[PDB]
Amino acid sequence: GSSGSSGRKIFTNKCERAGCRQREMMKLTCERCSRNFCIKHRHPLDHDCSGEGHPTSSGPSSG
Ligand SMILES: [Zn+2]
Numbered sequence: 238g239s240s241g242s243s244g245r246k247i248f249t250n251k252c253e254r255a256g257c258r259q260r261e262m263m264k265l266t267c268e269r270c271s272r273n274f275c276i277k278h279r280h281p282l283d284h285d286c287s288g289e290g291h292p293t294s295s296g297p298s299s300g
């Protein structure tokens with residue numbers, strides 16, 4: 238039985254911004270978080286950039 242419908246085509250990109258459905262003909266990835274976004278949210282100032290900002294260091298083993 239048909240379960241789930243996959244969709245992937247090299248035509249347009251999909252912004253990774255919250256409550257955003259902007260499709261930029263060209264691919265736009267941030268330089269800090271390295272995530273896809275729309276020209277509008279392409280800048281790290283018009284989008285909650287969570288790339289190079291949160292301090293992380295190896296500690297726990299589990300995970
Ligand atoms: Zn966007």
Ligand SMILES: [Zn+2]
Binds near residue numbers: 270288
């Ligand atoms: Zn970013």
